[PDB]
Amino acid sequence: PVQRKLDPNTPFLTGMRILDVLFPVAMGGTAAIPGPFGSGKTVTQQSLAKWSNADVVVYVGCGERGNEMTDVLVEFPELTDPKTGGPLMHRTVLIANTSNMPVAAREASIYVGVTIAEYFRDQGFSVALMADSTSRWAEALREISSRLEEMPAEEGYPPYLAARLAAFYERAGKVITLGGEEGAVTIVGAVSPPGGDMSEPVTQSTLRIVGAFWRLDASLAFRRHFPAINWNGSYSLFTSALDPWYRENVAEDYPELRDAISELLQREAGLQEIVQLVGPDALQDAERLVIEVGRIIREDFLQQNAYHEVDAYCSMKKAYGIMKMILAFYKEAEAAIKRGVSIDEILQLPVLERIGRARYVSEEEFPAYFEEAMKEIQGAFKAL
Amino acid sequence: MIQGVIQKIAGPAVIAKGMLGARMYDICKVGEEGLVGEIIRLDGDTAFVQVYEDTSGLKVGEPVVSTGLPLAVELGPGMLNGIYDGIQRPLERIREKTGIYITRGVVVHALDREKKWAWTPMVKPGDEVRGGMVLGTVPEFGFTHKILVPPDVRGRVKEVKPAGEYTVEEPVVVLEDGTELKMYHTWPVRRARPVQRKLDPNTPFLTGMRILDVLFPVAMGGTAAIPGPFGSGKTVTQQSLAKWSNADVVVYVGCGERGNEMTDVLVEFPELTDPKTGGPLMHRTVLIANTSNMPVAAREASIYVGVTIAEYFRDQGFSVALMADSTSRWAEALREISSRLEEMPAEEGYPPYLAARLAAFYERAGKVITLGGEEGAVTIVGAVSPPGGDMSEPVTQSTLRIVGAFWRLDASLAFRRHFPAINWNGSYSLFTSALDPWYRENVAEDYPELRDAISELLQREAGLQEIVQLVGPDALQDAERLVIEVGRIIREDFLQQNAYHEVDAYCSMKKAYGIMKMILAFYKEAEAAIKRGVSIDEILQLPVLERIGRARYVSEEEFPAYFEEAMKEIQGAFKAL
Amino acid sequence: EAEAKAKALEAQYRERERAETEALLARYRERAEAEAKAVREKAMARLDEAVALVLKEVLP
Amino acid sequence: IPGIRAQIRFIQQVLEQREREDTFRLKRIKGKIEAREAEEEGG
Amino acid sequence: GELLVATARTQARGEVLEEVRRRVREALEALPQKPEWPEVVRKLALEALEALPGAKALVANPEDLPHLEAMARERGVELQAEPRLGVRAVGAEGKTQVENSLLARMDRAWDAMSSKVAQALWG
Amino acid sequence: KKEYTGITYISGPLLFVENAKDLAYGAIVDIKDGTGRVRGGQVIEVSEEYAVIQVFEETTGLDLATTSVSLVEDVARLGVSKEMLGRRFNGIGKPIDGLPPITPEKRLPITGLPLNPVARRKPEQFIQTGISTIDVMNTLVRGQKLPIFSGSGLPANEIAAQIARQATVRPDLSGEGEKEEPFAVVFAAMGITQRELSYFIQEFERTGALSRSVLFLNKADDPTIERILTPRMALTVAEYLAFEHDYHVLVILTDMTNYCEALREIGAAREEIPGRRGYPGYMYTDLATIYERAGVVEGKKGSVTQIPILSMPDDDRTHPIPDLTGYITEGQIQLSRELHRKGIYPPIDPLPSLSRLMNNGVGKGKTREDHKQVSDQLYSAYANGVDIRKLVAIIGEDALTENDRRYLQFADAFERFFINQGQQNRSIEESLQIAWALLSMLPQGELKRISKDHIGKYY
Amino acid sequence: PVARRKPEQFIQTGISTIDVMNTLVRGQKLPIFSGSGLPANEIAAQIARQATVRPDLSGEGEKEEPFAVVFAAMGITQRELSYFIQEFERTGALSRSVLFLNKADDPTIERILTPRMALTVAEYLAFEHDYHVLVILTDMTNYCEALREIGAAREEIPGRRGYPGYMYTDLATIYERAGVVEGKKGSVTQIPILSMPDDDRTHPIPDLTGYITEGQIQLSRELHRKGIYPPIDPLPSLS
Numbered sequence A: 001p002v003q004r005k006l007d008p009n010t011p012f013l014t015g016m017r018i019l020d021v022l023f024p025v026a027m028g029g030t031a032a033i034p035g036p037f038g039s040g041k042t043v044t045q046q047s048l049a050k051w052s053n054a055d056v057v058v059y060v061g062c063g064e065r066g067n068e069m070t071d072v073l074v075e076f077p078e079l080t081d082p083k084t085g086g087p088l089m090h091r092t093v094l095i096a097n098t099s100n101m102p103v104a105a106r107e108a109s110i111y112v113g114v115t116i117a118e119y120f121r122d123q124g125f126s127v128a129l130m131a132d133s134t135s136r137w138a139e140a141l142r143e144i145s146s147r148l149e150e151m152p153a154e155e156g157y158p159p160y161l162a163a164r165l166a167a168f169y170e171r172a173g174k175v176i177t178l179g180g181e182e183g184a185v186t187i188v189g190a191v192s193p194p195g196g197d198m199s200e201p202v203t204q205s206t207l208r209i210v211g212a213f214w215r216l217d218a219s220l221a222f223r224r225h226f227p228a229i230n231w232n233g234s235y236s237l238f239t240s241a242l243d244p245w246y247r248e249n250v251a252e253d254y255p256e257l258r259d260a261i262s263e264l265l266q267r268e269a270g271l272q273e274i275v276q277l278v279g280p281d282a283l284q285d286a287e288r289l290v291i292e293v294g295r296i297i298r299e300d301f302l303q304q305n306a307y308h309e310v311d312a313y314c315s316m317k318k319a320y321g322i323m324k325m326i327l328a329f330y331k332e333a334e335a336a337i338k339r340g341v342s343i344d345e346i347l348q349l350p351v352l353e354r355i356g357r358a359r360y361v362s363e364e365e366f367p368a369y370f371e372e373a374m375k376e377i378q379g380a381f382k383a384l
Numbered sequence B: 001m002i003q004g005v006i007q008k009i010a011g012p013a014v015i016a017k018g019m020l021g022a023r024m025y026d027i028c029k030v031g032e033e034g035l036v037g038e039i040i041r042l043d044g045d046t047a048f049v050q051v052y053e054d055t056s057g058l059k060v061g062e063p064v065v066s067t068g069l070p071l072a073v074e075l076g077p078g079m080l081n082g083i084y085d086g087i088q089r090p091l092e093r094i095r096e097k098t099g100i101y102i103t104r105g106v107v108v109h110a111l112d113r114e115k116k117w118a119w120t121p122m123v124k125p126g127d128e129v130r131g132g133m134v135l136g137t138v139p140e141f142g143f144t145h146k147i148l149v150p151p152d153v154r155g156r157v158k159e160v161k162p163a164g165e166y167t168v169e170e171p172v173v174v175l176e177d178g179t180e181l182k183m184y185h186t187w188p189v190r191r192a193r194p195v196q197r198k199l200d201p202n203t204p205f206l207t208g209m210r211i212l213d214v215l216f217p218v219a220m221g222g223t224a225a226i227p228g229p230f231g232s233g234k235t236v237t238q239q240s241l242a243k244w245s246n247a248d249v250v251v252y253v254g255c256g257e258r259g260n261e262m263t264d265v266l267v268e269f270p271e272l273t274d275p276k277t278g279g280p281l282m283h284r285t286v287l288i289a290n291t292s293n294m295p296v297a298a299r300e301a302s303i304y305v306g307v308t309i310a311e312y313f314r315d316q317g318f319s320v321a322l323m324a325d326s327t328s329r330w331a332e333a334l335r336e337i338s339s340r341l342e343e344m345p346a347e348e349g350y351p352p353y354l355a356a357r358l359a360a361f362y363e364r365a366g367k368v369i370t371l372g373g374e375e376g377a378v379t380i381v382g383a384v385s386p387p388g389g390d391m392s393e394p395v396t397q398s399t400l401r402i403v404g405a406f407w408r409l410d411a412s413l414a415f416r417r418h419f420p421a422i423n424w425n426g427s428y429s430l431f432t433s434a435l436d437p438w439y440r441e442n443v444a445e446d447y448p449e450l451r452d453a454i455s456e457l458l459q460r461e462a463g464l465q466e467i468v469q470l471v472g473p474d475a476l477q478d479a480e481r482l483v484i485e486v487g488r489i490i491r492e493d494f495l496q497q498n499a500y501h502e503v504d505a506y507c508s509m510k511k512a513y514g515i516m517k518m519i520l521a522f523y524k525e526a527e528a529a530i531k532r533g534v535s536i537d538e539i540l541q542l543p544v545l546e547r548i549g550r551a552r553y554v555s556e557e558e559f560p561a562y563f564e565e566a567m568k569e570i571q572g573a574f575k576a577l
Numbered sequence C: 001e002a003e004a005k006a007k008a009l010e011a012q013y014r015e016r017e018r019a020e021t022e023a024l025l026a027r028y029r030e031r032a033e034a035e036a037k038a039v040r041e042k043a044m045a046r047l048d049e050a051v052a053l054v055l056k057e058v059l060p
Numbered sequence D: 001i002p003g004i005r006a007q008i009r010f011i012q013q014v015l016e017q018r019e020r021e022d023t024f025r026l027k028r029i030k031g032k033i034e035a036r037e038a039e040e041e042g043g
Numbered sequence E: 001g002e003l004l005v006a007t008a009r010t011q012a013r014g015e016v017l018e019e020v021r022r023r024v025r026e027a028l029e030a031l032p033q034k035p036e037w038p039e040v041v042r043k044l045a046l047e048a049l050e051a052l053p054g055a056k057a058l059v060a061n062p063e064d065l066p067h068l069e070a071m072a073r074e075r076g077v078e079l080q081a082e083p084r085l086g087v088r089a090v091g092a093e094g095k096t097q098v099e100n101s102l103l104a105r106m107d108r109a110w111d112a113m114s115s116k117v118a119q120a121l122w123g
Numbered sequence F: 001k002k003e004y005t006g007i008t009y010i011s012g013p014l015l016f017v018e019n020a021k022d023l024a025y026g027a028i029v030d031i032k033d034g035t036g037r038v039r040g041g042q043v044i045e046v047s048e049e050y051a052v053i054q055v056f057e058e059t060t061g062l063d064l065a066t067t068s069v070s071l072v073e074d075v076a077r078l079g080v081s082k083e084m085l086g087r088r089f090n091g092i093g094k095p096i097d098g099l100p101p102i103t104p105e106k107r108l109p110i111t112g113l114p115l116n117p118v119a120r121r122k123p124e125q126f127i128q129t130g131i132s133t134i135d136v137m138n139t140l141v142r143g144q145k146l147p148i149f150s151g152s153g154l155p156a157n158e159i160a161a162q163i164a165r166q167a168t169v170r171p172d173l174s175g176e177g178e179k180e181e182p183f184a185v186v187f188a189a190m191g192i193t194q195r196e197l198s199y200f201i202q203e204f205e206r207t208g209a210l211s212r213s214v215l216f217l218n219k220a221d222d223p224t225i226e227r228i229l230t231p232r233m234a235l236t237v238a239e240y241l242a243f244e245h246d247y248h249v250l251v252i253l254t255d256m257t258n259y260c261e262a263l264r265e266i267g268a269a270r271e272e273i274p275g276r277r278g279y280p281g282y283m284y285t286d287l288a289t290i291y292e293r294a295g296v297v298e299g300k301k302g303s304v305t306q307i308p309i310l311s312m313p314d315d316d317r318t319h320p321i322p323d324l325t326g327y328i329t330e331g332q333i334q335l336s337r338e339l340h341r342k343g344i345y346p347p348i349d350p351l352p353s354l355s356r357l358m359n360n361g362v363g364k365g366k367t368r369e370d371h372k373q374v375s376d377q378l379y380s381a382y383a384n385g386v387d388i389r390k391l392v393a394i395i396g397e398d399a400l401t402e403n404d405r406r407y408l409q410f411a412d413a414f415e416r417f418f419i420n421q422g423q424q425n426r427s428i429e430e431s432l433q434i435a436w437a438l439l440s441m442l443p444q445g446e447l448k449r450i451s452k453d454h455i456g457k458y459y
Numbered sequence G: 001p002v003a004r005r006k007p008e009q010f011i012q013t014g015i016s017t018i019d020v021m022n023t024l025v026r027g028q029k030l031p032i033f034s035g036s037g038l039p040a041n042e043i044a045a046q047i048a049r050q051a052t053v054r055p056d057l058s059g060e061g062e063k064e065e066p067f068a069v070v071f072a073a074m075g076i077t078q079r080e081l082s083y084f085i086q087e088f089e090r091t092g093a094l095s096r097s098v099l100f101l102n103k104a105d106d107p108t109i110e111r112i113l114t115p116r117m118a119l120t121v122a123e124y125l126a127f128e129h130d131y132h133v134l135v136i137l138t139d140m141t142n143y144c145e146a147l148r149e150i151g152a153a154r155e156e157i158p159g160r161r162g163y164p165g166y167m168y169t170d171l172a173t174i175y176e177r178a179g180v181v182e183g184k185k186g187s188v189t190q191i192p193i194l195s196m197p198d199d200d201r202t203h204p205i206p207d208l209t210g211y212i213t214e215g216q217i218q219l220s221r222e223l224h225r226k227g228i229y230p231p232i233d234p235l236p237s238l239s
C-alpha cells in the first residue's frame, strides 16, 4: 500500500529521442508498446536497462523464448552501471520465464514481480519493470477458461481484462508512503498483438489506460530503423508537469525547440500526402525543403542504435544541441532560398554530414563537436 | 446378422436400437427397400445410420439389418462400356423398370451376372498362388482382361476348368483349400487396393491440347484441379479429353450431376469412337455418372467408386485416366453431413475431417507398379466450384499443397470464350522437370528451349500492359510493340482451340513443335528489319499472319505440308524490305 | 582435334571409374559376408544362457 | 475507388459472419450447460 | 559398401535374438506337463486375485484345471473354461478381465530386457 | 494386464470404454480387437469412470464385444541408440526398412524435461551455408530456428537440399581444430508425397547423407493422428546425440502446417474454442513446447540447430499460424514471389531478413572486421531502391535525380546476380566482394551508416 | 437422364436479340438477371405471346408442338400482380395456364411448394399430353429468401453467410428435368427470373445459381439509361 497519493513530476529518463524526448513521460507513469511478430519489442529494452534514471531494474519476460534471454543472464553481471560500473544484477533478481513452464505459471510470474516492485517502491526505490507481453496473460487466462469450460465473452475473451489490468497499474505511481519515501513505479509493458489489431481486446482496452502509446510497424524498421512506431500513433500526456523540470534541467527553451521540432515532423504530413498523390513531381522548394529536413531529423537523429554504444547513448544536452543544428540549417535555408538559392545548392552542403556524425561522438567530445559545428553553418551559408 | 430396428429419424440420418456387438460401418439395410445406410456412431448399442437414398414417410421400429460388411464392390468382367454408377447399380435394366425415372431404393444386380466370358486358364491345378496373381484372361473388346487373384488370396489350386465361355456366376477355378473362383470380387472401397512399388513419372501423359501440355505437363498420378468460375471451360475440357488421351482405360465419373447438363453428354461419349481403334469410345470408357437427384452422400460414395475401379485396372498395368468433375461435391457432402450428425464445425461448413480424404485420393493416386508386377498409373483430374466464384478456400489451398500442378482461369476471356482461358500467370506445372529426356527424345531439345523462349514474350508483355495503359501503346517505339502484337497470336491459337471444328479438336506435339517455331522467325526478321529502320506497320500486311491462323485448320498430315511452307516467305520478303 | 583430346579424356574417366566401383561393392560385401558368419558363431555360445536367464525371470 | 470498395466489403462480411460461428458454437454450449442443468438437477 | 556391412551385421543379430525368442517360447511351452507348471500357475493366479478386488472367475485348461482346486476353492470360488501359459480371471463383478498371462509376462519382457541379452551377445 | 469391457462412445476416432478410473495421465494403450487387428490409443484425458482415448486409426469394423483394452504404458517414452543412425522410420516409431529394430540403450519420456535457460550455452556460432542470402542477411549461428514461408510452387525441399550440401563449418575465423564440428543428419516428416519422396531420397544417395541419418517418415496415407506425435519422437532422439555425441544437429522439421490441423480437430471435437480464426489459440503453446527444445548446451558441444519448415497459406504471413510461428522463431525466411516466375535459382526475397542473431555473440572475428555496417547500409539502401519502383511507375518516365536512379538500378542488379546461385561455394568474402561491387557505383558520401574507411578499403 | 431425348426445337421469340445471343430451344434454364429498375416482367410476358415455336423453319409442320405455358405468380407485389391481367386478356395467354398465387403474403412455405408444384403439372401434361410447355417462374429471389427463414427453425449453420447450403439440394429438384423424352412429345423449358443481390456477381445468391444450371441472361440497367428494348448483358451473356 502507500500512505497517500502523490503526484509524479519527475520524469522518466533514458533519453530515447522520441519516446522520452518527444514524448516526455512521467517517472511515476507507465506506458507501452504492442508488437506484431518479431518486431523488436524486447529488443528495445535494455538500453533502457542501463541508461535508466531508475533505482531498480526488474526483469521478467513472460513465457518467452529461453534463447532470447539465455544470453542476458550472462550479460548483465558483466554489464556496467554508469554510476558504479557494477553488475546490474545488483538491482535485479531476474524472473525471466519461459514456455514449457505452466501456463498458469505464466501468470504467477507477473503477479510476483509486480509485488516485488511494490516492496521496493515502498522503500522509495523506484521501479524499472519490463514485461515481455501481457498477451501471454490473455493467452493463458482464457485458456483457463476453456479448460474450465466457462462461456467467455465475445472475441473469445472472458472479461477479466480491464479487471485484471486496470487494477494492477493503479498500484503504480510516484507514491509517498507511510515511511515517507516515495516510490515511483516505472514499468513498461509490451503486448503481442499478432494482427496489428488495434482492436485486439487487449490492445484497445489498454489504450487509454496508462500513458503513452507507441506502436510497432515492422517492414519500415526492416530497413535500418528502430524504433518504428507511428509517431503520430503514439502520445504523451505529461507535457505539463515535467515542464518545470525540463525548463531548468536541460534548458528553458527545451520544449520550445523540441516542440518546434516535432511541429515540423508531423506538419510535414502536409507534404507527404502530395507525394503519395503526385510525387514530389513538383520538385519545389518549400516542399523539398521540409522534406529533407524532417527526414534527417529522424533518419539518424532520432534513429539510435542500441547495438552501438554512441548511437543510442546520448544525453539530453547532446540531443538538445543536435536539434539546433538542424533548426539552424533551416533558419539560414529560409533566407538562402529567398536570396534566390535553389535547394539544389543547399543540397550538397558537406557540413550536413558533419552534422550527421554524432552517433559516433561521445558525450564529452560532443560539446566540442557541436561547438565547432555551429560555426560551419554560418560559414557555409553567408558566403554564398 | 447384427440386427435391431429403427429408433429415430432426423431426415436422412437415423439412429437405431436393438443393435449390439455391432461392426463399425457396414451395409445397413433398413426397412422396405433395404435402405442402404452406414454405421457411423457406436455409442451404447446405438448406431448412427446414414442412408444413401431418400428415406421418407417412415416410422420407428422398422427392420434394421447390419451386414457385417460394408461396400466391397464387384470387380471383374463386363467392365468397359459400363454403367454401374453411383448407386452401384447398372442403369440398363433399371431405366425401363423404373419407367424412365429414377426411383428410390430400386435394387438390381450390380453386374451382368449371367454374361458369359472368355475363360482363359493361364494356370494349372495343384498350383500355388498369391493374392494378386493373374489366373486367367477374358479378352473382351481389345483387351486381355486379367483375372486377378485378389489380394490376400493365395495357394492351392484344386482345379482349373478348361477354357471357354462362362458366366461370372460360374466359378471356373476351384482352389485346393476350397475356393470357387467366380469371376468377380468385392473390394472394400475405402480400403486402398495396394501396390508393389510406386513409380516415377518419366514421360508426360498426354491427352491433347497444346499449351496445356507443352507448358504444363503431367505426372501419371497427375492432378491438378481446375479452379474456374461458373461457366468455365473446365466442364467440357474433361469432355474434350474424352476424345483425347494417350490412355489405356478411360474412366469417367459424373459426380452427382443434373440431367440436362448431361443429356448430350451421356450420349456423346457413345458418339465418340475410339482412336486407338475406331469402334465406340465406349469400348474403353465407362459411364459411372450419377445424379444430383440422389443425395449428396451417394456422391461421396461415388468418389470412392471412381478410384477403386481405376485401381483394379491400374493393377492391370493400365494408364488410367480418371476425370471427376467437382470437388464441390465431395466437399459439400460431408460439409453438411456433420451437422446432421451434429459434430463440431469448422467454418464454412468445413469439417476438418477434410483433406484427409482429399489427400487420400491422391495417395491412392499415382504411377506405380502393382502387386501383379504390373505397372499402371492412374492419372487424376480434379475440378472445383469456386464459391464466390473466386478463391478463399483451404479446400483449394492445401489442395494445392497436395496436387501435382495447378490451374487458374479467366472470366474475361470466357466472354470471347477461350479454350482455355488459363492463366499461367497463376498456373504452373512442376512436371516440367521429371520428364525431361522424354521431351528431347520425342520432340528434341529445342522444345525445352524454345518454350521458355515463348513465355518470355508474354512475360515481358505483362510488364508492358502497364505501360500500355499508363500512357498508350504509343509512347512506345518500334521494338516494344513488336513483342506486344506477337503475343496475340501466341494466345489466339493457344486459347482459341475449339471442340466442334474438327481440325481444331486434335493437336499433337507435332502440331506443337511446328507452330512454336514459326513465330520466332517473325520476331527475328522484324528484329533486324526495324534496325534497318523499318516500321512494323508494313509487317502487318504479311498475309502470312492469317496463314498462321490456319494452324488449327492445318491437320497433322498437312502439318509438314504447312510447316516448311511458310518459312521461306518470311525470310524473303522481310529480309528484303 | 582439341575437341578430340577432350573426348579422349572422357574415355578413361568413364572406364576406370566403372571398373573400380564395380569391384568396390563386391569386395566390401564379401568382407561383410565373412564377418556376418563370424558373429553368428560368437552368438552360438551365448545362446543357451540368455534363454535360461530369460526363462527364469518371467515365471511368477 | 470502386475497386477498393469491394475489398472492404469482402473483408467485412467474413468478419461479420464469424460472429455467427461463435454463436453457433455458443448455442451448442448453452445446450451443454442446459443439458447439465437438466440431468444434474434432474437425472 | 559400408552400409551393406552395417546391415550384414544387423542381419545376423536379428537372427540371433530371434532364435533366443524361439527357444524361450518353445521352452515355456514345454512347461505345462511339468509339475512345476501347477506350481507356477498359482503365482499369477494369486497375483491376479491381488489385481482383482472382488474375484469371480478364473480359467484353466482341462489339464490345468486340477492345479487350482485349492484356489478354485479360494478366489472367485470359481473355475471355468480354458485360457494358456498364463492365467486369466475376471473379478470385481465380471466387467474387468484384468489378467496376467505368463505369456503376458512375455510380451512385456521379451522385448523389454531384450536389451541386456543382446548386450550379453554383442558385448 | 488390465482389461476392460464395453464401448461407451465411438464416433470419429475418439474413444471411450468404461471401468477405467484407475489410470494415470497420458497413457499408451492398445485396443486388441477380435478382428485380428489391434489398434492403438493414447489416454489423452482421463475421467473418473471412463476416459478419453485418442485412437490412431480407422474405427472401422469395431464392435462392442471385440473390445479389449490394453495398458501399454501409463506414460510415454521411447528408447534411444545411435544404432538408429542411418535407419528409416515410420511415424509409429518403428524402423521400416526390413532391418530388425535396434535396441533401446536408454529410454526416456517423449516429452522430456525442461531446461535451465542459464544452462543453455549461447548461440553465436556462425557457420557458412554458402548462400549469401543467409550468409549476410539473417545470419546463421548454430542453435537457430528459422523457417521458410512457403507454398505454391515454392520449393522448400529443393532449397533445403542446397543446405544439405552446403552445410559447412568455419573453424577458421576462430582458429580451431577440424574434427570439432560434426553435424547430425536428422530428418522428420509430415503428410509427405511420392513425388517428393525419391526426390528427397536421392540426396542421401547423392550426398551420401544417409550418413548418420535418422529419418522419420510419414505420408498422409497413414491416419492423421500421428502427425504431431512423431515430431516429438524425433525431437527427442536429438538431445541424445546432441549432447552426448556432440552434434550440431541438422534438424529437419519438415513442414509443420499439418500439425495444427489434425490437432485442432481433436481439440474441438472435444470442445476447445478456436478464438482465432478457426484455430485454437493455444496452438502457440502447442508449438512452443516443440521449439522449447532448443539451445547450444553448456559444457557439451550440443547445439540444437533447428530447421523448422512450413507451408503457409496463400502468401499470407498474416495467417494465424505463420503469425505466432513468427513470434516464436529466431529466424525468418521468405522465398520471393517475385522470382519463381522468372525462375531464379533460388527465389528468395530480402524481406523478413534479420532474424534475431547477427550482433549478439557475433559479427566480426568470427566474421571479419568489416561486414556489419556494410550489411547495415545495404538494408535501407535496397529499400530506397524498390521504394520508387512504384512511384516512378507513375510519375516519371524518369524525372529522378539519377543518383536516385542508381538506387533503384541497384536493386535489379544486386538481385539478378545475387539471387541466382549455382552450386557455388560463396564464402563470406565472396559475399562482401559482390557487396562492394554493388556499392561501387553508389558514390561514397551517401553511405552514412558506413564510416569512410571501409568503403574505400573495399573498392 | 439416360431415358430422354435431348432437345432441339426452338423457342422462337419475337425479340431478335434473344435469338441472336442465345440459342433457345426447349429443354433448359436461362436465368434472367435482373434488379430494381430492370424490366423483366414485361419481357417474359411480351415474349409470352411473342413466343412461338416455328418448326417450319426446321423442316416439320407446325401442327406438332403446341404452345402453352404455366407460370404462377408468387412472392411478388400487389401492383405487379395486378398488371399482367389484361396482358393475358390481350392475347388469350391465360388459356392453358395456372397461377397458384401468393403475391407475397401467405405463409412462407407455400412459396416453396408451388414452384415444384407448378413444375410437376407440366411434368405430367407436357409429356403425357404432349404439350410443349414454356415455364418461367418469377421471383426465385423469394425462394431462397424465404427458404432460409425456414431452416432457421431447424437450426443448423447457414450454408455460407446468410444463405443455406442445403439450398443446393433443392436446386436439384427444379432443374433436374427438362425437354423431350424418348417416345414423348412434351418438353419443358424453365427459366429463372430473379435479380442479382443488387448488381453483384459475387454473392452465392446468384453465384451458386449460376454454377449449377444452364443459360444465363442479364439485362443491363446500364442500358436502361438508354432504354434499349431489349437491353442485355452484352458480353457476359451465354446460352
Ligand SMILES: Nc1ncnc2c1ncn2[C@@H]1O[C@H](COP(=O)(O)OP(=O)(O)O)[C@@H](O)[C@H]1O
Pocket: A035, A036, A037, A038, A039, A040, A041, A042, A043, A044, A226, A227, A305, A306, A307, F354, F355, F356, F357
Ligand atoms: N531496437 C533495435 N535496434 C536494432 N535492431 C533491432 C532493434 N529492434 C529490433 N531489431 C532487429 O530487428 C529484429 C526483429 O526483432 P526481434 O528481436 O526478432 O523481435 P521481438 O523484440 O519482438 O521479440 C531483431 O532481431 C533485430 O535484428
Ligand SMILES: Nc1ncnc2c1ncn2[C@@H]1O[C@H](COP(=O)(O)OP(=O)(O)O)[C@@H](O)[C@H]1O
Pocket: B229, B230, B231, B232, B233, B234, B235, B236, B237, B413, B414, B416, B417, B418, B419, B420, B421, G211, G238, G239
Ligand atoms: N473453352 C470455352 N470457353 C468459354 N466458354 C466455353 C468454352 N467451351 C464451352 N463453353 C461454353 O461454356 C458452357 C459450359 O461448359 P464449360 O465451359 O465446360 O463449364 P461450366 O459447367 O463451368 O458452366 C458450354 O456449354 C459452352 O456454352
